[model samples]
Target: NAVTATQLAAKATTLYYLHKQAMTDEVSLLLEQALQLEPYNEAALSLIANDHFISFRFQEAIDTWVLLLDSNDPNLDRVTIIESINKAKKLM
Candidate 1:
């Protein structure tokens, strides 16, 4: 069962909007769907990681951010990711 990239992108966009609207539960489910469709999706991973951080789930945030860092998505800021990881680790 393979999801098309276009479907993944549409799901990711919806996830982003849900997150922006502060709909945490909806964002969580949609983000999971986006990641399941495209594990290396920078948008999905970044938003989920940020959601964890905002919810004070430091360890979870660190875990997801680590995945993002390992992904090496060109759209992501390596420096910011590193800084975020460091911040989460400090909080943990």
Candidate 2:
């Protein structure tokens, strides 16, 4: 039950709303609720970042991606993020 509930496709929509509906607490009520569930849950933070980068906010994408570097979790792909940063630098 815990596993299948959060599908990959669904994850994006969650952030899509989280990113777009960032202002109004009407929607952030959901994210802010999720926020309290875990402090510094950067995985959720990264979802929105990836989309923002794709939407062409290159600087922020790099910032969010680079910030994750500090966590240094082995599961977090270091090379992938840096390349994204490199590309962002290319644009900006």
**Candidate with maximal TM-score:** 1
Q: Candidate 2, after superposition: displacement of residue 72 in Å?
A: 4.1
Q: CA lDDT of 69 in candidate 1?
A: 80
lDDT of 1 by residue, 1-92 (tens): 77764365456557566656364565566666777767877777776787688888999998988887877557768788889999989898
Per-model TM-score versus the true fold = 0.66, 0.59
Provide C-alpha RMSD values for all models, in order: 3.9, 4.9
Model 2: per-residue Cα lDDT over 40-64, one tens digit each: 3455546546766777889888887
Task: Name the runs in model 1 displaced over 4 angstroms.
Answer: 1-25
Candidate 2 accuracy as TM-score: 0.59
List the global CA lDDT of all models: 0.74, 0.59
